[PDB]
Amino acid sequence: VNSFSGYLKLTDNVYIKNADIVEEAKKVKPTVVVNAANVYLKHGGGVAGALNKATNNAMQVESDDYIATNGPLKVGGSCVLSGHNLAKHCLHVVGPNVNKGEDIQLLKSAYENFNQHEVLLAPLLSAGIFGADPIHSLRVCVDTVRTNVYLAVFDKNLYDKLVSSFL
Numbered sequence: 459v460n461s462f463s464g465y466l467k468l469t470d471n472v473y474i475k476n477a478d479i480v481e482e483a484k485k486v487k488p489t490v491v492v493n494a495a496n497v498y499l500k501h502g503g504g505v506a507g508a509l510n511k512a513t514n515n516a517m518q519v520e521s522d523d524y525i526a527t528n529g530p531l532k533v534g535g536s537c538v539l540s541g542h543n544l545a546k547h548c549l550h551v552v553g554p555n556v557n558k559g560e561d562i563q564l565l566k567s568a569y570e571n572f573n574q575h576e577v578l579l580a581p582l583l584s585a586g587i588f589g590a591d592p593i594h595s596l597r598v599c600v601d602t603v604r605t606n607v608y609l610a611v612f613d614k615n616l617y618d619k620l621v622s623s624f625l
């Protein structure tokens with residue numbers, strides 16, 4: 459039993475809710491919240507900008523030190539950093555950004571990072587300002603992640619479309 463509430467069950471291990479991931483993280487304080495990161499961990503907009511803003515920019519400060527030490531992530535890769543006031547840990551995962559021409563096949567590699575964590579609160583990777591089709595992202599999630607994932611979808615209209623079209 460866990461504290462996630464109001465989710466629709468899609469499969470054995472994947473759950474979905476119309477929710478603001480920032481507000482959901484604040485309330486659940488999950489072990490792991492996933493950030494929709496870029497390789498530079500520049501958390502300017504989308505989910506990343508919202509998560510970082512909720513940490514009062516502490517996520518960005520920590521991220522800048524990480525990059526200065528380690529260099530950029532790979533597209534499809536991830537790193538574990540602090541969850542600050544939102545979660546124990548933040549798993550920063552880089553999905554491909556279609557608006558940069560990155561290969562959508564890397565979306566599966568991106569979701570594979572979730573399998574290193576037993577339970578996660580997450581957005582749909584490569585959705586929103588990353589330019590991929592969220593219906594496809596949900597399909598890859600379901601077909602790749604084997605651990606327990608609680609997906610937060612900000613837009614109510616999109617949430618309803620994702621549920622209604624789910625196979």
Ligand SMILES: OCc1cn([C@@H]2CCCN(c3ncnc4[nH]ccc34)C2)nn1
Pocket residue numbers: 477478479480494504505508581582584585586587588610611612613616
């Ligand atoms: O159409 C509106 C819309 C845009 N996006 C992008 C794409 C990926 C998912 N998403 C978020 N997912 C959960 N929480 C959030 N808070 C703030 C953003 C957010 C950001 N999603 N819906």
